[PDB]
Amino acid sequence: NLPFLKPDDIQYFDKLLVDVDESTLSPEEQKERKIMKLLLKIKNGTPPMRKAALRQITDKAREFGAGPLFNQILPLLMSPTLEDQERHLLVKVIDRILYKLDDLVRPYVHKILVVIEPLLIDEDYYARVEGREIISNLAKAAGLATMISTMRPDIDNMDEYVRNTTARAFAVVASALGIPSLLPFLKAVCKSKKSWQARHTGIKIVQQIAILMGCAILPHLRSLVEIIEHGLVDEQQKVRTISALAIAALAEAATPYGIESFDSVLKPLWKGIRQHRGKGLAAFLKAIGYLIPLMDAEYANYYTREVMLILIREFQSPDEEMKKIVLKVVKQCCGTDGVEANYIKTEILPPFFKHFWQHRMALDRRNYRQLVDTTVELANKVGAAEIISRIVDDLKDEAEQYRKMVMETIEKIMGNLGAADIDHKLEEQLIDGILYAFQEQTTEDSVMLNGFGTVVNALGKRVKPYLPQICGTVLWRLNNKSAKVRQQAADLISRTAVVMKTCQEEKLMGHLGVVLYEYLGEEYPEVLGSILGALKAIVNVIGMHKMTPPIKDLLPRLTPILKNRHEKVQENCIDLVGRIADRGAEYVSAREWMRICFELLELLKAHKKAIRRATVNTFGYIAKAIGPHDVLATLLNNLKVQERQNRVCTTVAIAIVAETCSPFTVLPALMNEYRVPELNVQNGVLKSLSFLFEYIGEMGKDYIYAVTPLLEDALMDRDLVHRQTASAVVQHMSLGVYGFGCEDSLNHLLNYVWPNVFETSPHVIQAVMGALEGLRVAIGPCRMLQYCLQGLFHPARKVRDVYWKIYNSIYIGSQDALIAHYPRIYNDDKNTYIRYELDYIL
Amino acid sequence: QSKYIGTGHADTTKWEWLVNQHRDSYCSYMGHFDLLNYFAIAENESKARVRFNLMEKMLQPCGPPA
Amino acid sequence: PDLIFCRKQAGVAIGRLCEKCDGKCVICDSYVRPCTLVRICDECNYGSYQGRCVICGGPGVSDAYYCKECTIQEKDRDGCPKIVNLGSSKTDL
Amino acid sequence: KDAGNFDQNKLEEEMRKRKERVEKWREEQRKKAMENIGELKKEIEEMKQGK
Ligand SMILES: [Zn+2]
Ligand SMILES: [Zn+2]
């Protein structure tokens, strides 16, 4: 009963589709070909039906033939139709076959090496990981000698891609078959002078192994450096570059500590910085950039001074390979603790500001990222004030391209250092540059928008004297009437709202509120959300009636805004309505608040969790301001309306009252709602008490004995739906009153909840099973097992089916807690049942 | 393996229940401290002695039909 | 409607959830007071499985947590809480 | 408000003027620099010079 077939699996889909009789008339062991169709069953079929094929092939690969098995398994995954899950399944199958066919995988080494090699060089990380795993499995299948004899003659591939693939294959084979297991063979086959191909492939395999292993290069660090030091003074520049790359990879893998083996080539690395030419000096600098942070504190200064002769001199890079390498080396040197801030400010600050700190890289994305990262890393060491008073020009420049990177670096420095290193003239220059960048925002540059808030936060109390500048800036950016411009202005105002409005001014509040409530009908939902956020920030910073928009006008104006279906707009409007009743909170007619609550009650279960949280955060203050009795009566009347598709949320609103007011605000009012003889009235009351005790928290311990009879009367033999509600209430109240000293009422409720265990309803047992699983963990097995012990061997076959299930549910929980709870099973004459090892008197 | 090991089911024999009882009651003896420093005071043996005794008793205690 | 779970060795992978299935716990299925963060096994974040919801089984938008009523009951200490069954298996639509 | 608005406008104008002045100064500085660099004139092909 496998699933349907597919035209993509037509390579071996003739078993279940055609009369491919491998046992009637076919070659020897032709059924293994049908096993490929079984592989389709592993791909096309069920999870257990797919794993059964692998479980069977695991005990049949030895009796299937290595040749045909490989010839049918390799092309199956070699095709481009190998999906991600399909690739994983094929890799697992090949690994199982190799674990079964260990010595048989030797003749097929030429196959997987030609197949797993490209897959290991794929683009996706999962593909490379699967290729490396397949290569490691193939290596572990046969011996190291087979892998050596396979990867050694493969060096004749003159193609650079083929050579790199062979080097990566050898590195993967050595990373799993033992690094020192293949180290001597590789060192003996690569130490010769055949040609540049082998000399390059040696360093390539070394770097590939160091990159694939990772932190596992600590013991084999010197063992590999002993063979890699033959290229540090190599004649050919290509071999020298390969050796430098391998040394840098090893230093990065074995970093930061353990620079002992690095001293074996540390002298040439520190000498040849200003000795090589072009690619040689580039490779030397790239290796020194990694060796510097791993170096010690004494020789680090000497190495930096020896490398600066060729680093600071060639800071201006004709190409990108030199510029990026120099930037990385400078970043690594700044990260090192050797060169102090004084040396950087003396010999590193002026060169970095002259050759690097400029608008000459306003279009290089990689350069714009590298220079920004290096500046952000070096600002913490050279002082933020040393750069805050020296980068106030690139942002104010008319070139917006370099201005974006300058603002990004300034924001990064402000976020890293903070606001301590901020001079008066430096602060004024930074404010002027930020204002010029924000005003001259001809493009969509979010860097300035993100940095304005950081600068305002760094201002702190200094933003008060600088109030009118930012005020006029925000006014010019808000009255521009541009969509994206207004959005960015509202965002920047909401970010820097608490810093400016909360400065104890009482003068800009009106000027802000007049423009805030003006553009209330923005068609763009993002602009509307930004305006709502700005108004919320103003209401949080301003008060009643300190806020410019009147409360009696902003409330009815914001009322229809909450009815919108926009996600961000509604999310902001909920918080705005909540904060409207934050400080003073009256500012409304009771009918308006009741209507707002009735409208928001339908949004308490929205898809976005943010709206669900904001609704509960606002309804609490709404109910605290309106009143307990009115809100309770409204919620109770709302229980019958809004039929059970969104009715339960209303019950949650009642719980919000319990979370918004004292427990006696909803308890006595909801108690009278049970006196009605209606079935789905008491049912709704119980469904509401469930969420009430599930969300009331640790407050149930204060009042739990007064609600015991209300749950007991509902737990009686009343109906089939009035039983799950009482059990859920009990389970959600026991967990909430866990260990708080209310076990009496818990026992009172359990006395009734136990007889309801005998229920054949498949949908009604879980309501009691969960109650028992909660009572076991909130009561202790010393009493639950005491109840459940009388029937552990009851004669009824359908009575033990529930008692053993409850015992299992009470066993995995409190496994060793119930050990000192069992009775003394007396000793029979056929064994030793009594546990006499616990009846000592000592 | 670890599906439900530790307890039987609807027709679990009394012996097979007491066997799991003792087999999971000694692990609270070899692991717990008060119930291990208390048994080495009664039997008057060291921790290693009592622990090895309890470990060897986990072969088939309670009276094994072996 | 009895959902199944993976329940394998809980690795060092954090949980996730969809834009609609982010609040409720992967096991308790409740939105009330998330206590601890959920995890996954090794076969729950592997290639295509990277950053997938534990309930919706699609895109991840947050971290999968457990309910306070489900973490106090020691339910989080079970295997991989990924919601997978015979129907919700790897080869599902 | 018939006087406050005017004052605000004046302030804005002043700010704009200041910005313009700053820009002019920057331009002048750039011109001066163009008088002589700068790491080594056009230091881009010097480090390259083939490969
Ligand atoms: Zn989901
Ligand atoms: Zn899982």
Q: Structure tokens of A382?
A: 């050279």
Could you give the CA distance from residue A22 to residue A14 in angstroms, rounded to a whole number? 11
Strand partners, D22: none
Residue A170: both structure tokens together: 């050898």
- Nearest to A353, CA basis, from A329, A386, A324: A386
A102 token code pair:
């260990």
Question: Distance between CA atoms of A41 and A393, rounded to whole angstroms?
Answer: 68
Structure-token pair, residue A315? 């800071």
- Report the greatest alpha carbon distance in chain A: 101
Asked if residue A36 lies in contact with residue A76, where contact means CB atoms within 8 angstroms, the answer is: yes
Contact B2, A818 (CB under 8 A): no
Q: Is A678 on the interface with D (CB under 8 A)?
A: no
What's the maximum distance between 2 C-alpha atoms anywhere in chain D?
Answer: 71
Q: Which residue of chain C has the CA closest to A773?
A: C73
Q: Domain residue spans in chain C?
A: 4-84
Contacts of B58 (CB under 8 A, 6+ apart): B23, B26
Distance, CA of A142 to CA of A524 (rounded, Å): 66
Q: Do A816 and B24 touch (CB under 8 A)?
A: yes
CA C46/CA A278 separation, integer angstroms: 43
CB contact under 8 A, A278 and D51: yes
Q: Which residues pair with A114 in a beta bridge?
A: none
Half-sphere exposure of A661 (CA within 13 A, CB side): 22
Chain A: closest CA distance from residue C40 (Å): 18
The neighbouring-strand residues paired with C52 are C59
CB atoms within 10 A of CB A418: 14
Radius of gyration of chain C measured on its C-alpha atoms: 12
Chosen from A436, A442, A475, A515 to mutate, greatest number of chain D CBs within 10 A: A436
The dihedral through the CA atoms of A794, A798, A802, A808 has a sign that is positive
CA D7, CA D5: separation in Å to the nearest integer? 5
Residue located via tokens 């053993």: A804
Reported residue count of chain B is 66
Note the residue count of chain A: 842
SS3 state of residue A677: coil
H/E run at residue C37: strand C34-37
CA angle A607, A612, A613 (to 5 degrees): 140
Helices (H), A346-445: 349-351, 365-382, 384-388, 400-417, 424-439
Using CA atoms, how far apart are residues A318 and A577, in angstroms rounded to an integer? 59
Q: Burial level of A187, CB count in 10 A (0-12/13-18/19+)?
A: middle
Q: What helix, strand, coil percent values describe chain D, rounded to 5?
A: 65, 0, 35
Q: By the 8 A CB rule, do A522 and A562 touch?
A: no
**Residue C53 assigned as binding residue:** yes
- Which residue type is seen at A53? A
Sign of CA pseudo-dihedral A597, A602, A604, A609: negative
CB A380 within 8 A of CB A344: no
The residue of chain D with its CA nearest to that of A322 is: D47
Residue A819 forms contact with B (CB below 8 Å): yes
* Spatial distance between the Cα atoms of A244 and A250, rounded to a whole number of angstroms: 10
Put residue A67 in one of left, alpha, beta given phi > 0 → left and psi -120 to 50 → alpha: alpha
Contacts of residue A444, Cβ cutoff 8 Å, sequence gap at least 6: A484
Question: Comparing C-alpha atoms, which of A548, A555, A600, A598 is closest to residue A574?
Answer: A600
Buried b (16+ CB within 10 A) or exposed e, A18-38: eebebeeeeeeebebbbbbbb
Q: Which residues of A201-221 are buried (b: 16+ CB within 10 A; e: fewer)?
A: bbbbbbbbbbbbbeeebeebb
User: Tokens at residue A80, please?
Assistant: 């481009």
Which residues contact residue A725 at a Cβ distance below 8 angstroms, ignoring those fewer than 6 apart? A683, A686, A687, A689, A690, A714, A767
8 Å CB contact between A632 and A657: yes
Tokens of C52: 């997938």
Q: How far apart are the first and last CA of chain D?
A: 71
> Is C35 marked as binding a ligand?
no
Calculate how close chain C gets to A782, using CA atoms only, in Å: 17
> Which ligand has its closest atom nearest to the C-alpha of A609?
1
The tokens for A120 are 């290991």
Residue C37 pairs with which residues in a beta bridge? C65
Q: Rounded to an integer, what distance in angstroms lies between the CA atom of residue A89 and that of residue A99?
A: 15
Gap between the Cα atoms of A461 and A451, Å rounded: 18
Which residues have a Cβ under 8 Å from the Cβ of A158 and sit 6 or more positions away?
A197
Q: How far is the CA of C40 from the centre of ligand 2 (A)?
A: 5
Q: Exposed, middle or buried by CB within 10 Å (0-12, 13-18, 19+), for A397?
A: buried
Instruction: Spell out where A95-225 has E strands.
Output: none
CB A270 within 8 A of CB A306: yes
Nearest chain D CA: its distance from A71 CA (Å): 46
Instruction: Please list the alpha-helical segments (H only) found in A479-606.
Output: 483-495, 497-500, 508-516, 525-541, 551-562, 567-580, 590-600
Report d(CA A65, CA A94) in Å as an integer: 14
Return d(Cα A448, Cα B42) in angstroms, integer: 77
- Helix H or strand E encompassing C13: strand C13-14
Interface touch A830/B63, C-beta < 8 Å: yes
Distance CA A480, CA A80 (A): 55
Q: Which of residues 2-31 of D touch A (CB under 8 A)?
A: 8, 11-12, 15, 18-19, 22-23, 26
Q: Give the closest ligand to the alpha carbon of residue C21.
A: 1
In this structure, chain C runs to a length of 93
- Cα A357 to Cα A366: distance, rounded to the nearest angstrom: 15
Closest CA to A78 of A33, A13, A149, A130: A130
Question: What phi and psi values does residue C62 have, to the nearest 5 degrees?
Answer: -155, -165
Question: Using beta carbons and an 8 Å cutoff, which residues of C are at the interface with A?
Answer: 19-20, 22-23, 30-33, 46-48, 62, 68-69, 72-74, 86, 89-91
Letter for the amino acid at A421? Answer: D
The reply to whether A506 touches chain B by the CB within 8 Å rule is no
Q: Cβ of A263: how many Cβ atoms within 10 Å?
A: 15
CA-CA distance, C64 to C50, in Å (whole number)?
14
Taking the CA of residue A427 and the nearest CA in chain C, the distance in Å comes to 39
Name residue, tokens 């001597």: A184
Which amino acid is present at C45? N
Q: A242, A200 in Cβ contact below 8 A?
A: yes
Q: Give the DSSP letter of residue A402.
A: H
β partners of residue C67? C34
Are C13 and C40 in contact by the 8 Å Cβ rule? The answer is yes
What's the token pair of residue A522? 């923005």
Residues of chain A with Cβ-Cβ distance to C90 below 8 Å are: 47, 85
- Kindly identify which residue of chain A lies nearest to residue D4, measuring between CA atoms: A511
Q: State phi, psi for A418 to the nearest 5 degrees.
A: 115, -120
- Span from the CA of C27 to the centroid of ligand 1 (angstroms): 12
Distance (Å) from the C-alpha of residue B41 to the closest C-alpha of chain A? 7
- The structure was resolved to a resolution in Å of 4.1
CA A408 vs CA A93, A127, A415, A509, D26: distances in Å: 50, 35, 11, 31, 20
Rounded to 10 degrees, what is the CA torsion of D27, D29, D30, D36?
150
Q: How many CB atoms lie within 10 A of CB A627?
A: 16
Provide CB contacts within 8 A for C93, sequence distance 6+.
Answer: none
Of the candidates B10, B27, B42, the beta carbon closest to that of A800 is on B10
How many angstroms is it from C25 CA to the middle of ligand 2? 15
Half-sphere exposure of A63 (CA within 13 A, CB side): 6
> Which residues are C13's β-sheet partners?
C40
